[PDB]
Design a protein around this ligand. Sequence first.
Ligand SMILES: Cc1ncc(COP(=O)(O)O)c(/C=N/[C@@H](CCSC[C@H](N)C(=O)O)C(=O)O)c1O
Ligand SMILES: Cc1ncc(COP(=O)(O)O)c(/C=N/[C@@H](CCSC[C@H](N)C(=O)O)C(=O)O)c1O
Ligand SMILES: Cc1ncc(COP(=O)(O)O)c(/C=N/[C@@H](CCSC[C@H](N)C(=O)O)C(=O)O)c1O
Ligand SMILES: Cc1ncc(COP(=O)(O)O)c(/C=N/[C@@H](CCSC[C@H](N)C(=O)O)C(=O)O)c1O
Lengths: 380, 380, 380, 380
Amino acid sequence: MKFETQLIHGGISEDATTGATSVPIYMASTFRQTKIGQNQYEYSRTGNPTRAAVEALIATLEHGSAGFAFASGSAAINTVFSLFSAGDHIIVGNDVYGGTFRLIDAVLKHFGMTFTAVDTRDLAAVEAAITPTTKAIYLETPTNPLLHITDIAAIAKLAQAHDLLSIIDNTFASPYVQKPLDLGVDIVLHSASAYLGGHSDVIGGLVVTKTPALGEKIGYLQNAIGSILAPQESWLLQRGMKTLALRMQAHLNNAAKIFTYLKSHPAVTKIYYPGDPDNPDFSIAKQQMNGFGAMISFELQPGMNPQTFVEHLQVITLAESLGALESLIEIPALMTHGAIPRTIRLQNGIKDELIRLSVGVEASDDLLADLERGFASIQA
Amino acid sequence: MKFETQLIHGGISEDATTGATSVPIYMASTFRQTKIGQNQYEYSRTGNPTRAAVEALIATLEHGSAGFAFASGSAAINTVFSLFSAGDHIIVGNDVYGGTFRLIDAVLKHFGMTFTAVDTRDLAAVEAAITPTTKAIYLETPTNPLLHITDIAAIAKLAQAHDLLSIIDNTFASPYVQKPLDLGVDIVLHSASAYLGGHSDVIGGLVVTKTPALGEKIGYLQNAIGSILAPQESWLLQRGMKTLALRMQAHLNNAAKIFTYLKSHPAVTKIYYPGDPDNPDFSIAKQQMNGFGAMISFELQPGMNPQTFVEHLQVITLAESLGALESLIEIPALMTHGAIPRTIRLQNGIKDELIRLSVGVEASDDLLADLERGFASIQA
Amino acid sequence: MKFETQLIHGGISEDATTGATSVPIYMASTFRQTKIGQNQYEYSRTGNPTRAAVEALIATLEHGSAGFAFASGSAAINTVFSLFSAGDHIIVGNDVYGGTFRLIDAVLKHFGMTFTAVDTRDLAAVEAAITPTTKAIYLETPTNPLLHITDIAAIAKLAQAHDLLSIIDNTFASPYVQKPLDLGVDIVLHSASAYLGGHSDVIGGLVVTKTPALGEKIGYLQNAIGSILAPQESWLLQRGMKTLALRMQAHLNNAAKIFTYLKSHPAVTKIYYPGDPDNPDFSIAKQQMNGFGAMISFELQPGMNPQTFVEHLQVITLAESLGALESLIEIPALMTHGAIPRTIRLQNGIKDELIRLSVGVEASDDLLADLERGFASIQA
Amino acid sequence: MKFETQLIHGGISEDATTGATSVPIYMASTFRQTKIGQNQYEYSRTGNPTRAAVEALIATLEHGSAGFAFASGSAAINTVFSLFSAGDHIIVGNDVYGGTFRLIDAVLKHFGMTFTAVDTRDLAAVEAAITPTTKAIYLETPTNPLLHITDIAAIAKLAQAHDLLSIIDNTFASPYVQKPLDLGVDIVLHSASAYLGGHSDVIGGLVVTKTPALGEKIGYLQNAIGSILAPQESWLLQRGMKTLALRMQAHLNNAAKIFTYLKSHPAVTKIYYPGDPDNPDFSIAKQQMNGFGAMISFELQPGMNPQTFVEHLQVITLAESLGALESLIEIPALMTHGAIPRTIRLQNGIKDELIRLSVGVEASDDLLADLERGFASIQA
Ligand SMILES: Cc1ncc(COP(=O)(O)O)c(/C=N/[C@@H](CCSC[C@H](N)C(=O)O)C(=O)O)c1O
Ligand SMILES: Cc1ncc(COP(=O)(O)O)c(/C=N/[C@@H](CCSC[C@H](N)C(=O)O)C(=O)O)c1O
Ligand SMILES: Cc1ncc(COP(=O)(O)O)c(/C=N/[C@@H](CCSC[C@H](N)C(=O)O)C(=O)O)c1O
Ligand SMILES: Cc1ncc(COP(=O)(O)O)c(/C=N/[C@@H](CCSC[C@H](N)C(=O)O)C(=O)O)c1O
C-alpha cells in the first residue's frame, strides 16, 4: 500500500489464529515439537513469532528482503562485521558514531581486520582507498554528529564495480527519509533506539538485507552469535514503529524551524544541517532524502560556554541518544564521541564546543523559547 | 548470609528510594544529566538499574566480583572470546554445546583464533595442548550432552601455571551446584536460559569475573559490542533466580529417581549421569558438585527407535533447551548438536541414538509413569 | 507548555533520582517502610510511581486536579457510580455505549439506583427529568455510536443550578478535542482503550476530577474497590499518550476525507458525523470541539447488506473497539450494542443496518480504495 | 495428575499452534473477525488467551469449574458481592481483612446491602444470624490477622440447608493448603497478590466457582464491570503460580520453626498460629488444612514496643502484603487494619500491640537470628 499504511499493517502485524490486532509477546524460550524438524519454531533465540514480526516490518519498510533484530545497534553492527575474516580490509567513513569507531579500533582490528577512514563525499578518495583485500564500504549518512551527506547510489555503484559490499548506517534518516537498498546497497542497519522505537524506551538494532543469499548469512550469524532483540522489546519497537510517519513529520518540521531560528542567531557561529543551502551537501541531500532529518549540530562563538548553554535548557533535555519524542541535546566531545581521541576528533571535524541537538516533537514555540533560555545564559 | 537467603535478598533486590520489594523495570533508553559526566547512569546499553541488579545477583551467587548480563548465552560466549585477538590459541573441551562448537568453527576461526579440542578430564592431554600462543582454556562441566565431569581446580592450577585464562561454562550445574570461581577460575559464564531463569521463558547469558581488572575488560566489551540483556528480561531472570534453590533441589531429587529408574531398565543400554557410581567421573563429581545435576543422557538398545520413544512421551516435552520447570527431552544428533558434523559427533561420543533428558520439577511418580509410556511404545 | 509539549513532558514523565527519560515500571506489590506511616508509597494498589505518573498526565491534559487510572473504562465508570447510594436518581443520555447501558440495568439498579434516559441535546428534556432524589447527570458526547453532540457547558450550568454532579464520558473526543472540565463539569472519564492508548493494545480507564474534594472521593473508591490499572499497562497508556496529538490530527483529517467521500455515495442513505453541516448538532460541535472527531456512522440503502460490505473490506478491520491506529469497523446492533434490547435500540436511533467506522491513521488513499472494495461487493 | 504437576502443566500452559512453552502475552485490545459472532475472542476485557490461561489454572488447582482473574483481590471481592442487590443480607466473619471491612461499610451498605458480623467458629452464632433476607455467608480462614480457623464444610452445610451462598476467602491458605470447593462451597476467591503470585510483584485477584451456572454469573459481572487482570500481570501470576508448591513447603516449614522459636520466648505473651496445639482451632485446622499456613501473629509483653521490635529487623522487611518470598512483617493496627475503627478492632481481637509475620522462604537460621535482633532491641 502506501508507506503510512505499511507501518500500521505491514510486516506481520496481527495473529493469524486469534485475530489479535497485536503480535503476541512470545516469552517462551522453547517450543514443543510433534515430529522432529517439522516444527515451525524451535528456540526463541533462533526465532520466535514476536521478533519475527518486527523483523518482517523493518524489511518491508526498507524495501528489502529480510529483517534481523538485534539487542542494540552496536550488536547489529558487530555481527554484520562478523561476515568478514582476518585479512579483510574495510573502507569506513571519516565521521561515524564514536562507538562504531570504538568497535573497529578496540575489537575488530584484533580480528585481523584492517580499516581506512575516508570522507565518502569525495568519491575519488573512496575509489583510491580500494585495495585487493578490500571487501566492503561502511558509512553513515547523515553522519554522527556532523551530518555529512554521502551519495548513496554513487557509493553503491563503486561497490558493485569492485565486488565490494555496501553497508549504510541509516539510523539518522530512517526509512521515512532514506531507503538505501533502493539505491544499490546490500546491507542496511539501524540503531532502532533512535527514531524507529522513537519513544526513548528501547535499545535495539535492525539489519535489513536485499539479496536473499546475504539474508542467509546475516541470519546464520544472528543465531550463532545470539545478540538478538528480546520479545518484550521487539514488541515495543514494532509498537513505536507504527507512529514513525506521524512522529517523523513532526521532527522534520520542528527542525526546519530550529535551523532558521539558529541561523538568525549571531551567537551561533557554524551550523550542521543537511538542509542548509550554502552547505555543499545540500543537493545530494534533496536528491536522496525525503526531508532533511531532524538533527542539527551547531557551534557557539568561541568565548561562549556550551555546557552553560546546555545546562540551562529546561524543556530540551541533556542526555545521550537521539530520535526521541523529547528533544535531546548533547556535547559530542564530552559525551557520545569521547570514545574517539581528542586529536582524531579535532582532525575529523569535531571541536570541543560542538553541540548536537536531536530536534523532537514538542511544540515548536516551546522549543524556541527554551533555546532562548540557553542563549540568554551565555549573554546573547 | 546463607545461599538460600542470598537469592531472595542479594545482589540489588529492592529500590533504595521507594522501598519497592522489586527492582523497577527501567525501560528508559537514556538518562538526563544535571552536570555532564557526573550522572550515575547514562545510556541503557552501558548500564541501567534493572540489568545492574541482575548483574549484582549472579556475581554474589558465584562468589565473584562482577556480573555481566547478555542477550543470550551465545552472546555472552561471543563477547568473552572477544578478549582474544588473531594469533591466539585456545584449548577447548572435546564435548561442548554444539553452538559453542559452531561459534568457534564458523566465526572465531575467521578472526585468526586457533583451537584444539581436548578431553579435559585427561590433564596430560590438556597440558600437552598448551602452545606458546595459547591464551586460555575453555570447557564445560558437566558437558553438553554427555555430562563429562572435569576437574575444575585442576584445570585452574594448570591455567595459572602457564599464564592462561580459565573459562568454565557453568550452565548445567548452576551456582547452587558449582561455583567455579572458588576453585581458581578467572571467568564463569552461564546460559541463563537454563536453570537461572528456570521457567522456560527467558533467553539470556551471564558472565561473572573474579578479578576486578578482568571485570573492566568484560564490561568494556559488553558495552562496546552491546549484546546486552534487556530490562524486562533482566527483570525476569532475577525473578526466576529467586527460586533457584527450591527448584534445583526438586530437579536433583527427581533426577536421582530417574537414574535409578533408567538403570533398572534393560531397554537402556548406556547412561550418562555424574552420579552413576561405575562412571569414573563419579568421585571428582562428589568433590566439586553439590548434587549431581538434573541432566541424564541415555541410549536405548540398538534396534530401538529413540524418536518413537520420545514422540510418545506426554508429560515430558519434546523440545530443545533445558533447565526448565517442565522436563524437556531431546535427541542431540537431530537437534541441539546438529551443528556438529556427524563424523565429529560419533568421534566425540554422540551416537545418533542418544537421548538427553532435562529432569524437571513435576511429581516424580508422574514422570516415571510417563517414561514408561515411551518404553512401552518400543519394546519389539 | 503548549498542549503538544505537555504530552511529551507533562504529568510525571521521568524519574527524579536517575534521570530516566521514562517512568520505571514499578512491579513491586509492596514497599518497605523505615518508619510506619512516613513511607511515600505503601501498596501497589493504593498507588505506585508507575500508575501515579499516568494519573498525573491525564489530569494535566484534561485541565483537572487529579487523575485516576482503572483496569478498564467500564471499571472506571463502575467506581465513579459507586459515589451514589440506594435512593439516588441519575439522569443519563439516551445514546450511550451499550455497556454503560448494561452496567446500569444489570448492576446499578440492583443497588437501589434509579435512572431516566434523556436526549441531553434537548435541555428542557434534561431540566424536566430532575427529581428531588436526582444526584447527577451522566452523558457522552459524541455518543456511542450515533455521535449526538451535547452542549457540555449547558449541561454543566443545569447541574450546578440544582446541586447535581456532571459526568461526561470523553472517550470519543479525547482531551485533544474536548476538555469538559473547562466547561463546568465535575468528573471526566475515559475508556483509555480508545484514543489515549491509541495502539490497540491496552484496556484501561481514566477518571479526572476538577475539585480536590471529589478527587478525595474518587481516590478512596479507587483504592477500596481496587479496579486499578496495572503497572505495565499504565506504562503503555502513558507511552501511547505521548503521540496523541500526532495521531489525533491524522485521525481527524482522514475522517474529513471519509465523510466527504461517503456523502458522495448514493449507496449511503444516512451519515452520522459531528461535522456534517446539515446535522443540527453542527454548531455546538464547532463551538466546543477542536476537530469533529474521527468516528463516522452511516447507513446503506435498505436492500444493501452491511455484513457483506464489512466482510469485504481488507485494509479496514472488522472488530470491536475504536480509537486505534488501524481503522476498525463494526455493526453496533450485532456487536458493541447487542447488550441493548433490539426494541430499545430501534427506539433510540440504532437500526440493525447501522455501520460504525473508527477512522484510523493509514494513508487516506488506501482507505477510500478499500471502502470502494466494500461498496463494490453490494453493487454500488 | 498430581498437584505439583498441575502447577507446571495444568490450566492452559502452552500455545497450541506454535508449541510455545509459555502462554503468549496477548496485548491486543481487540481481535479481527472473519464472520461476525463466529470469532473465538473479540475484546481483551471480555477475555483473551493470556488471562484465559491463568483463569484455567486457578480453577483446576481449586477443584472448581471456572476461573476469573481480577485487577486486585479487592476488585474480585467487589464484583462477587455485585451478585447481591439492595435488600439482601450477608453474614460475614468477625475477623476479615480490613479492606473487606471497608468495602462493606463504605461501599456495599450504600447499595442497600445489610451485614452481620459473626465468629463463624461458633456455628450456632452463624445459624442464629440467618434472616429471611439473608443470601450468603462470607468468611476467611485463616482470618486476617488473627488466623481464626473456621470449619469450612460445616459452614457449607449450613449454607445449603438455607439456600445461601458460601464465599470463602482462601488467600492465606492457597489451594496447596485448602481447596474449599471440595467441602461444599460455591465461590472461592483469592488475593493473588499473596501466595499465588508469591514474588511480591503482582497485584491481582482470582475467583473460582464450582457450579457452571454461577460461573456464568461471575463471568457476566467480570466483563460488565471490567475490573479484569491485565495480560502482563495475568502472565506473571501464572508464572509465579508454577512454583507455588515449592515455595509453599518452604513457607510452611519455616513457619513451624518460627512458632516453636517464638513460643520459647517469654517476651512473647500471646501467639496466633493454626498449629498452636493449645489453640482450640488446632483440630479443625489439621482436618481441613494441608499444613498450618505460614502466617504467625504474636503479642509482646505490654511494656514492650512493637515498632521498636519491627524497625530493628533487617532481613525481615517492614511492609504491608504477605505471601511473598521475602518475610514481611507488620503491625495491623497501624497498617493493614487501620481501616477498622480502633474500638471495633479491640472489640474483635486486635490489640494495638499485635504483630503479624508473614513467614517467608529465606533460610530459617537467618530468620531466627534476625528476630533475635528485634528482641534484643526491646530486651527479652
Ligand atoms: C548512527 C548510530 N549507529 C549505531 C549506534 C549504536 O546503537 P545502540 O547500540 O546505542 O542502540 C548509534 C548510537 N547512538 C547514540 C549512542 C549513545 S552513546 C553510548 C554510551 N554513552 C557509550 O559510551 O558507549 C548516540 O549517538 O547518542 C548511532 O548513533
Ligand atoms: C552449556 C550451554 N552453553 C551455552 C548455551 C547457549 O545459550 P543460549 O544462547 O541458548 O541462551 C547453551 C544452549 N543450550 C540449549 C540450546 C538449544 S539449541 C539452539 C538452536 N536450536 C540452534 O540451532 O542454534 C540446549 O542445549 O538445549 C548451552 O547448553
Ligand atoms: C464511550 C465508551 N465508554 C466506555 C467504554 C468501556 O471502556 P472499556 O471497559 O472497553 O475499556 C467504551 C467501550 N467501547 C468499546 C467496547 C467494545 S464492546 C465490549 C464487549 N464486546 C462486551 O460485549 O462487553 C466499543 O464501543 O467498541 C466506550 O465506547
Ligand atoms: C485475605 C485478603 N483478601 C483480600 C485482600 C485484598 O487483596 P488485594 O486487593 O490487596 O490484592 C487482602 C489484602 N491483603 C494485604 C493488603 C495490604 S493493605 C491495602 C492498603 N494499605 C490500604 O490501605 O487499602 C494485607 O493484608 O497485607 C487480604 O489479606
